[model samples]
Target: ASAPIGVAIPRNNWAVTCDSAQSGNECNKAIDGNKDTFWHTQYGVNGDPKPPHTITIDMKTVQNVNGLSVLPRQDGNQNGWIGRHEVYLSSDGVNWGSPVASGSWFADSTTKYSNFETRPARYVRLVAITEANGQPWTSIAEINVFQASSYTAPQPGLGRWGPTIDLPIVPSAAAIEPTSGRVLMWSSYRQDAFEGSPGGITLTSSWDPSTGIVSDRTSTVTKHDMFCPGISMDGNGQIVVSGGNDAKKTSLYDSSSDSWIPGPDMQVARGYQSSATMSDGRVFTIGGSFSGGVEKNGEVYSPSSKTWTSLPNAKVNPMLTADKQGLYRSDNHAWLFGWKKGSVFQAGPSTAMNWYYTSGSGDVKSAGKRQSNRGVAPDAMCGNAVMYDAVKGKILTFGGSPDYEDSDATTNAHIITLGEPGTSPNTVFASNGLYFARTFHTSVVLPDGSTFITGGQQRGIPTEDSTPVFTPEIYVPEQDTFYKQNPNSIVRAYHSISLLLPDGRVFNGGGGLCGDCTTNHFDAQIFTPNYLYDSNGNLATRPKITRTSTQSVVVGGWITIWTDMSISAASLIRYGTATHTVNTDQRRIPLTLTNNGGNSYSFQVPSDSGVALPGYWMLFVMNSAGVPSVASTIRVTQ
Candidate 1:
């Protein structure tokens, strides 16, 4: 039910000029008074305003807007043309706000278009500050918009909780994202649950911020049943979770909400399977003994329509990493260097291309054979390879053993290339870095493209060299150099995992101690920009929206109005308002909406005791968008 009110004033309305000329042009210059420029309009209006002038856009309601597409026509007059360009946005349209992006533009002698993507926003304006100039300077043909996530209000109380830092509310494990931004998380037994780990209860989570991360109250959408799972987000943001043994189920999670349902169940009832998401948004689940004997079949989940697929088999698979395009996948096998194609579980001579860590292996290459570089089984290998996409084409590789067991310290660090990636599996960077005589550690590619290596034990998953021999080391791709970083935090191998959050902060969490030791219990820390990358390159960080302060006022006798800063997830807003000093003179201004991220924003001001009286009241929302622009009126008295 919606609140009733009188004639309503438009929300987030702005009349921006669409000029694409330099000077002495004909198109209407009223938008920003810059006539020489032109707006991308299909209706040719060179320096001349239509009988009515500027076109207007009206919305039935405020909501999240994804992007804008415009086509500008140049009737061969001006030699110059416009390319695609995106803009940093704001509430008023006059101010060029944050969020920088590159828009897609295609230009020719006659037609040119601009394509841009951002958080969300309403009341958008365009100005051709610079153009090709002269007669037929610039004209627009058509405009289209894409829908995005829109957050409209702030959360209650928790004002300065700082961005309300909410990542899927209850992230059971290190959320695995196969693509950038898409997240796939699941519940586990390691962490305490209200009813306790049911061994087979379905549990998973997924999320996609409309405007930004304002509110996640209604975000947890459910799909099917299964629990103690493993999930990942594909390139397109589709979620895929591999279920545990007791459940004997595989499932899919809708990014629209973080809930688990049914997907493609494997032929065997497997538990504790490992999975990975690819640049293309596909999911790959690897090995676990099905009934008794070590199983070899694996599974794959596709995001296109929410379904379960399978991969080639392996004895025992650890974790898996996919190529940038989501085409190929690789991991340490149980006792052999393993690789697969198509689905992991279905195998035959047709599915045999692979690299071997041990001597006896076959079919190294077959176009259709799902394949990966042959390496030692995870049990024999010292560490895992990193799937770094910083370079766009290749995934960076690092330290690990060639065989399941120790063959002396010689086989440590080396880089492997997956030939043009997304296509074949071949070793490319297996060189000099091999001399370090170490394996079993974690590596992170910094903003500058350099890599950081951390934590590895001395024995079988817990080696005799546990005292942090080399402490920490960094490798620079350009110099092909490796350097050591002074150790600061606790040092333990096989028992730690680090995640780079949206805020540009890297968080390190759970891991087991060594061969005999278990349990991943540790606090996390945030790394500052200085510790990250800068220069011509920097690491990708999350959006920062600060809450400076909140203002309160009284309307009737007990009414209150509140305003707060915007956050990443700006869906619901909550604030505090009070009664205005005046009297019976009171009016209701239905809650207004704005698209701070290039989309429409909607919020609500709940009616409480103070809402009807003439005193003080606290106002807030669930998911609020952008920073606190201003507060709308909540009636106190009539």
Candidate 2:
């Protein structure tokens, strides 16, 4: 089943050649299989050598080969890095064919893989076409060539999570705009208290999801501290931000201009507040920490007029009390489904309520009406994560804490089947629970319809001795089962957040606002799920959308989307606005995909504005293999 494979050449048997080498820079050091040695090009010894260097390996025998792995120099001062490179194979060691595989190399010290079809060659040539620096010297610590079957399936299992990007600040909030696929993150002025940041006081950055390139920190122009403000994207793809610590300063972030322009301030100054884009295209702000303490009033902002209007003060249930015999901080709560025109689901630590719209405006006669009794453990509050299931018209509430005293993280599941407009709903509890007891974690809806939950602690917010749950799990709706996957290297707790990127990857970043801040990190990790790879362990071909009827669509219209894959399903995911485990306008809307032959498909945009909402959404087309295409943004309007 296996062939004899070893270093193709012995140190003395192999001849070494470089474009130019220093007097003592022996090429034999590379294939010596020792970490302490490397070949130093003549550029580092004397004057710099010219561009385009080559390192050839003579196996001395024509052997079948699949690929080669290149290891960067591990010796001290390994600063001269290579950028672009190519690999060529020769049967006679005389006429080297064109490069069989080529790509940009990573800047890190990890080994990079250069894979190609299995071929027979006694000599292999690696050409360093360009250098990251202008040093003209390219050194490699070691090189490994191997032979294997070309049709081996990748390791069958869930994919792993690894750290990718490092942000400037410990993000208090983050959101991904749908259209441009730019990620926006902002934190209070105190982001650099511990570590010095180049972006001083106000920390915010926009990352290009397609390229993983983060822009410079864009200043938020506002003088006040934007601590804990509510943010959501408008129907035009503009980020409508509202409410902050003791300030009603509203601002709009325009990606094209890379500027934050002032919008109308809210009627109520809110801290620890929540905002959602309404189906009617209005940005609504709800209860937040206020003057006397928690405030109950809400406000609405009209984008067309660029003004804010006050809503009737929300009423709280007088009888609802916490386990500590204290009144529930009703105004210190968040809502999940405000996009549904008249009805908004108000979620609490251990309770669920709703506000029934009365006169179409923000006029609701009664506030905080009790909804379906989940009839299970009461863990629906502060640290819990609640998400809407558009396909089933249900609200799924995952892990949360019941009360503060180092409460055991509840593994209970609560699913509420939403009813007709202005009607009560039915709630049911799942008999099974999560494999890990987690709180303050994130539950992200994936393109495959499974919910990915990650990053939380076993108990209270991280203390100096806190243990974080690095392991992530996926809740498969079809299987009705929760399966644990790989563990993350970072200790994520407190202000941690996870976002679904355009390329079917989940970006988990931020955490730690208070004590045990050791676990907190100002970096991000991209989790690529297992479904992205084919059975043969190769990267599956992702569908590409070549054309769309319009970038902006109205409710009651059909939009034609042309893609390269035979599609099985197409859906729209609202641009995510997440903070503290609550994403208001983030919901999935399944679209009807009809085949038009020849890779063209038409989608029936939902007629109900409440179902799809009026805002920018990431349109994803799933092929028959359940692999989804990179999101194509489309702004859905009324």
Best-performing candidate as measured by lDDT:
2
Write the residue-wise lDDT of candidate 2 on 29-107 in tens digits. Answer: 7777876677767764358775577889887776666566667788656554555666788889889855655534434
Candidate 1 lDDT tens digits, 1-638: 00111122233342344433334333333233233344433334344322212323233333344334334433444333432233344444546553332221223342222222223455443333223332223344433344434333322221110111112112333442322233333334322131344354433333322233211222123332333334443434334455443445555544345444456665455543445443233555444432212334555455555565444433322233221211121332211111222221211111233321111221122322322354431222434343332122223444444332333323234343333313434434433553244444544444333455555544433323343433455666667766654433233343244443333333333233121222222222223323333233333232332221222332322222222333322211111100000001111122333434433233333232112222211122223322222122222211
Q: After superposition, how far is residue 71 of candidate 1 from its true place, in Å?
A: 66
Q: Per-model C-alpha lDDT, please? A: 0.33, 0.64
**Candidate 1: segments with Cα more than 4 A from true spot:** 1-172, 176-187, 190-198, 201-230, 245-247, 271-280, 290-295, 310-382, 389-393, 401-411, 420-440, 462-470, 513-520, 528-638
Each candidate's root-mean-square deviation in Å?
28.6, 9.0
What TM-score, computed on C-alpha atoms, does each candidate reach?
Answer: 0.41, 0.72
| RMSD of model 2 against the true structure | 9.0
Off by over 4 Å in 2: 1-155, 193-201, 218-220, 290-294, 316-330, 356-374, 377-379, 383-388, 462-465, 514-517
